[PDB]
Structure formats: C-alpha cells, structure tokens
C-alpha cells in the first residue's frame, strides 16, 4: 500500500507517534516519505546482506529476522515479513523500540539527511487529523 501524506499522518497519530519520546509527528511522516516514499511494501537489499523493510525501512541485521542475514540480532523480536503489511502496527511498534535507543531517529539515514533540521511540522500541515 502507498499511503497519502495526510493519510499516514493520521494513521501514525492513531498509532501514538505524535510526540513519542520527544519526536513530533512531522518527523515520522517525513521519515516515511524519504525512506520508502510512503510504500509499505518497499524493500532494499544492502551490501552486507541485510535488507531494509517496509514504510520505515527497518533493517534485518539489527531489528527484524528475515532468516537470510548474517549476524542478525532481531532486536524487535519480529519477523521482517510483518513489517511489509499494509497495516503499520508492527512497523510502528519496532520503530518505537529503535528510537528508544540513545541514537533516536538518527537510525534512519534518510530522515537524518532530509528531515533533521528542517521544518518537519510542514509534513502534517494541511491535513485533517
């Protein structure tokens, strides 16, 4: 599924990402935009053999288990397939654990390069929430 900008903002708010651990909602919508372009089925194989899954491109080496990545740690205790659903529940649950580390949202490279330091609130503006 490919979410609309406002559609995802409303969904993420419903999934408790408005002000989760100091991060305003716009951060998450922006991250999704640049990580997967709002596509829940997005996948990207990395050189180290790991793969990034879902709307928030969660990595298989540290966060989810796809059973095909070397030193997998499965920090989110979840199968990567669950992060490819049109239902964002699992991706949000795992993203919350990820951001609860001292590195915060810096775990998302696209967010760091295209969102951090920008007017992220703009990503939820003009939306019925």
């Amino acid at each position, epitope marked *: 599924k490919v979410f609309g900008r406002c559609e995802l903002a409303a969904a993420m*708010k*419903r999934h408790g990402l408005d002000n*989760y651990r100091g991060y305003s909602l716009g951060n998450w919508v922006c991250a999704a935009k640049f990580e997967s372009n709002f596509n829940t089925q997005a996948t990207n194989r990395n050189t180290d053999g790991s793969t990034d899954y879902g709307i928030l491109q969660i990595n298989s080496r540290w966060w989810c288990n796809d059973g095909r990545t070397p030193g997998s*740690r499965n920090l989110c205790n979840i199968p990567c397939s669950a992060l490819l659903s049109s239902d964002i*529940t699992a991706s949000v649950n795992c993203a919350k654990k990820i951001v*609860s580390d*001292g*590195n915060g949202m810096n775990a998302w490279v696209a967010w760091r390069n295209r969102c951090k330091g920008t007017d992220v609130q703009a990503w939820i503006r003009g939306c019925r929430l």
Partner: antibody
Amino acid sequence: DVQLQESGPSLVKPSQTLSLTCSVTGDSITSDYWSWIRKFPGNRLEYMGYVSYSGSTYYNPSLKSRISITRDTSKNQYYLDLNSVTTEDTATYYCANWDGDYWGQGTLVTVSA
Amino acid sequence: DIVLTQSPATLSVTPGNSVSLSCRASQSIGNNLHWYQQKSHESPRLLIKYASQSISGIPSRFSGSGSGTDFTLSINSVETEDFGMYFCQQSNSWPYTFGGGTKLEIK
C-alpha cells in the same frame, strides 16, 4: 527460550552501594534492551531505567543520579548499582527486558542499620 | 513526569462477572499505555501493550481500549486466577511511569 534471574545481597546498610545482577539465559544480552524495576512496600512500582543496544542508558530522575546500569557480554549478565542507599530504597527489585515479556522472579533488598 | 491515576483503588467482583479498570494520564500519551497483572510473590505480567494490542499467551477475556489520556482494561467474565493487582504503565515519555494500581478481589 529466555530466562532472567536476579542475584545479590538481600540485606544492606544505609549509605552503601546496593548491587544486583541479572543473569540472562537463552539468548545474548546484545540482542535486546534491558531494564530494572522495583516495587516499594505499598504496591508502588518505579521504573528505574534501562540500557539499550548502543550502550546508552536512561535513568529515572527520581534516583537523583545514584544509579548505574551496566552489561557484561562474556557473562551474559547485566547489573544495577545504586549508591548511598537509605531505608527508602528498601523494595523488591526485578530485572526484565524492555518489551516486558521476560521478567526475573524479583528479589527483596532491605536497607537497615 | 507523566502521572497515571488508576481507579477504583479496589474492586470486588464475583467470578463470572465482568469488570473494567480505569487509568488516566496527566497529559496525552497517544496509545503508549500498557497493562500489567501482578500477584503476591510474583513478578508483573504484561497483559496488553499499546492500549489495545493483544499479547500471545494471555487469555482472550482481557482487552484494552482508549487513547490520549483515558484508558481502560476490561475483563470479560472474571476467573479466580484473575484476582490480584493491575497496573498501567506509559512509555510515551522518559521516565516511564506506573499508575497506583487497582486491586481485584472476590466480593
């Protein structure tokens, strides 16, 4: 599967450092976030803090920076140190993973002169 | 810190009857409210995560609902094994905090 278990002295003196150990069995400590929670005499639970995969720690301000949570990969254990304890630190201490799915059995530590 | 207030402090019920437990937050916490059960001589047990998400291995009679500042834990047809303490905990902001707990007893 995963098993957690607390160990350490059950009796300590005021002003000393209280130290507990949580031994993890079933998987590496490097594969999760680890926490410490305690229960005071009147069914009052307090989340003490946790250490995440990067080594970063989060401590409850209520502890006024007297707490330290560390890990030892080789022994697959993590620890809790609480400095300058007082009778107000008497409680049942539990270790548990960040998700809350795995908990230790808990251990009562009494601070008395 | 975010303050969680639970009510009633105590609730007596007859097995077979249903009950609902309340937990309200001092500020909005989205869906970041979890429910724990704790019996004497035992460690807490996670029953519901993120306000309404089910937990594998927990009886289906337990359900959660709510968002923002008001949450509830419902037990459809209480069983003797359900008597004990119930605590809500928020993970929206650090430090995580717990409600004061609600004691469920046989009337």
